[PDB]
Amino acid sequence: GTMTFQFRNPNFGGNPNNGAFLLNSAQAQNSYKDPS
């Protein structure tokens, strides 16, 4: 069929339903503690 391009990010033009998955999979992988 036809391959239509779509952004996978709700910040750009994309479906908003994977916003809560994109952020929860980023805060589950960050290792930066608070510098002080």
């Binding site: 069929g1 391959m3 391009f5 996978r8 999979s25 960050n30």
Partner: protein, 246 residues
Amino acid sequence: ARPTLMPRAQSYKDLTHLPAPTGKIFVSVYNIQDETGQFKPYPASNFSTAVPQSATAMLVTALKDSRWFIPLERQGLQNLLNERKIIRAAQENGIPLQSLTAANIMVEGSIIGYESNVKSGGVGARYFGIGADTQYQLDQIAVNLRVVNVSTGEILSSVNTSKTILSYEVQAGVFRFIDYQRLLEGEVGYTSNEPVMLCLMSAIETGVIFLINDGIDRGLWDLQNKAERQNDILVKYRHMSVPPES
């Protein structure tokens, strides 16, 4: 961009350099029917056909530029006959036109089916934040062409051709946390649908050379020189005369 000619495959350069015959053969191309019966899926319209209805305009361009056939207007015959009434009405009132040129053979045929998503696939990979993926589909179109002897009504030769329409898509992406409480983000994507408009023209231009080659082996029409029987083009389409297996 800029307007230009329609882009052509290897078969069009393979069609123009054919050997020349003794005399050109007239041909009537009436109608190549879209007998696929297949429409485009969602999110396109329910009414849009998968294959364009203009295969009869593509075959006339294949026959005309092949330097073998002289095609005749039989598609808009009802408009051509209405024009020749207007000339004939001005003839009796204040050069006499001859009758229409008629053809020895008439090339007609169909588009035998269009199957979408014959094969598919896709790879993906994400390490920590950084990702990439790939997709591809390939559809299959098939064209039937047959030469009809219009004197007796027989069918002289009939061939089927095929073409695979690849449509891939490559997309990258980054969603990371760079140094504390900052967030990087980037996407790069690219798709490429091969047009079914252009793969129909390359399957018709190939099926013409299988008709011209089959005419020489069956003694229908002969070449201008028998030393040009061993051309590299005609010896290339004789190896492809056996079909692939399944």
